Design a protein around this ligand. Structure first.
Ligand SMILES: COc1ccc2nc[nH]c2c1
Ligand SMILES: COc1ccc2nc[nH]c2c1
Lengths: 206, 216
């Protein structure tokens, strides 16, 4: 039983995830502008100390999180400056009762928001990879998917996979896979995994 | 002027692309993004796209026949075929810069336990193929990875306008008894630059020591 609240200025970005859950979990999306104070519905402002872009306003985010979060909440803040989000993270968060995901522009949410929230609840600032996105929405989709697929209801790299037909455009499925020698098949797959990992992800081997 | 074709069995999942930076890029005519239902290239009643793996194992593998027909129709020799997969080469910022100058990206989204390897192998005889992962975590399908790649690449395209960035602040200067670091209010560009550099170093060593050549 997990509740996920997502807060974003692009709520429609998150709706496909909502219309993706089978038969249960609860995922709610909130337009950040609901907590703005002015008729212009301002969510960001110029950065102190100068610089390009805008920083999201602490008064707006503070009100939103005050309403949505509780002491039991794990507040997830996607940011390119975060700790890395990994499969281990996904496993850890899969047993949480309440995730709140705060989606901001990459220039950031005023740091006092996360710092204030951390005095009352658990806060996790995380990156999903080494690339820059305009905002946290796509990263939220990745996190929601990686976490929810580990909830009951819903090393080395894996090598190549094959299915019918056995011959296709002049390429045959490796005959070992058809051999009925399942110990040999396992060893072949292990070697394919070794070769692929060396080639594509040597970092996984040290 | 870039064209992106995305092929998937869940074309509805790719509608978030109609928003944010990608939506604005499309509306401004800098990119055209077209989403294709893979089942359009099936010929059986049940529109089957997957089958059990040779050699055993859990789950299903996407059929090469259907993918081959789809890619035959959509790709040319000039196409960069992008195949998101957890077993791919890493997609990084460098990759995003490289692909930002391509005329034509086709993104093949897989599901179940992946796409028959011969699809990528056959395609490579006629075009450039890149199998890529967007991070070290498990997803159900390549669709969310496609959205990440599109976002990362599109914001770099001409016309659409390291270490870790440290904390940022904006008004008011005091909030809930928490003050913006006084140096940021001082207007001293030298001192501000210095403090920001120190903040970034501190954050990088704590959160991403790998970026500076340290363990973990
Ligand atoms: C722009 O916001 C984000 C959020 C998480 C991220 N992970 C990598 N880049 C990111 C950018
Ligand atoms: C299952 O499809 C994918 C595609 C790219 C990926 N990058 C990390 N996990 C991934 C899963």
């Amino acid at each position: 039983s997990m509740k996920i609240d997502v807060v974003t200025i692009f709520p429609e970005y998150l709706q496909p995830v909502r219309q993706s859950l089978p038969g249960k979990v609860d995922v709610a999306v909130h337009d950040l502008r609901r907590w703005t104070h002015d008729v212009h519905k301002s969510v960001d402002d110029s950065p102190y100390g100068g610089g390009p872009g805008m920083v999201m306003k602490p008064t707006v985010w503070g009100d939103a999180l005050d309403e949505i979060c509780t002491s039991e909440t794990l507040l997830v803040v996607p940011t390119p400056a975060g700790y890395p989000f990994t499969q281990e993270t996904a496993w850890q968060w899969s047993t949480e009762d309440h995730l709140v995901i705060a989606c901001g522009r990459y220039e950031g949410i005023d740091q006092r928001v996360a710092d204030d929230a951390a005095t009352r609840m658990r806060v996790r600032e995380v990156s999903i990879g080494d690339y820059v996105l305009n905002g946290g929405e796509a990263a939220a989709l990745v996190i929601i998917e990686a976490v929810l697929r580990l909830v009951p209801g819903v090393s080395l790299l894996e090598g190549p996979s094959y299915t019918r037909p056995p011959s296709w455009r002049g390429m045959d499925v490796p005959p070992v896979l058809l051999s009925g020698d399942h110990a040999k098949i396992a060893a072949w797959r292990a070697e394919q995994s070794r070769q692929r990992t060396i080639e594509r992800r040597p970092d996984l081997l040290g």
